[PDB]
């Protein structure tokens, strides 16, 4: 019978073994001290939805938005990637800043968009994040959805707000429709056309979304875009 009395504080945090973590802290483990991966205990707690451990570590003075890991992200970033709405809610209540950007240039709304976490996208919008917030790459949440979520949501949710459907990202000037064609995201293509996506608007290389469709020799895509003019 493993009783956790042998586990290190990182493994015990991951698994939410609350009393194990608390004994290691009072015995001298600094809640602010990172591990060999430059990850803090708050990060591990957040990405495993350990609500109570999060309260406890913060009460011991853990830094809420401390960057860590190879991707150089806050604990809130981690919870957002993983999809823990309750943890996103909890961390934002302690002052975590959802607009901070990680090492990939993304803030929280983009992380939630690109991993398909529809309820967190809704929540960030309900807390004041702009639906068309541009990340460091010039990507909107709708672009990230078109590119990465091959699914009705979160695209359908995003289109219920006053998005500027024909924006293009900063470096490629690809609209969300461009991204969906690029990615073969057939579910999203119909939603964007139905929401007014311009099939002729050209990116920075002067290719329209129809051009990209024709390029990929995808008969279904070419027909569907052509019939939306």
């Amino acid at each position: 019978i493993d009783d956790y009395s042998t586990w290190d504080i990182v493994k015990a945090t991951q698994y939410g073994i609350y009393e194990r973590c608390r004994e290691l802290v009072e015995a001298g483990y600094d809640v602010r001290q990172p591990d060999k991966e430059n990850v803090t205990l708050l990060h591990w707690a957040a990405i495993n939805n350990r609500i109570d451990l999060v309260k406890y570590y913060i009460s011991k003075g853990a830094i809420v938005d401390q960057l860590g890991g190879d991707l150089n992200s806050t604990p809130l970033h981690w919870a957002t990637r993983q999809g823990h709405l309750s943890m996103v809610v909890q961390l934002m209540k302690y002052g975590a800043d959802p607009s901070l950007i990680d090492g990939e240039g993304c803030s929280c709304i983009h992380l939630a968009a690109q991993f398909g976490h529809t309820s967190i996208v809704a929540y960030l919008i309900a807390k004041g994040q702009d639906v068309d917030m541009m990340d460091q790459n010039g990507m909107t949440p709708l672009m990230w959805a078109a590119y990465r979520t091959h699914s009705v949501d979160p695209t359908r949710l995003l289109l219920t707000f006053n998005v500027s459907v024909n924006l293009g990202d900063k470096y490629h000037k690809n609209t969300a429709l461009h991204w969906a064609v690029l990615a073969g995201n057939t579910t999203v293509i119909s939603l964007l056309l139905e929401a007014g996506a311009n099939v002729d608007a050209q990116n920075i290389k002067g290719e329209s979304a129809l051009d990209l469709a024709k390029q990929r020799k995808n008969v279904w895509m070419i027909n569907h875009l052509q019939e939306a003019r």
Partner: peptide, 10 residues
Amino acid sequence: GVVASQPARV
């Protein structure tokens, strides 16, 4: 399972 690996590049 629990998450015991840090987020990585795609």
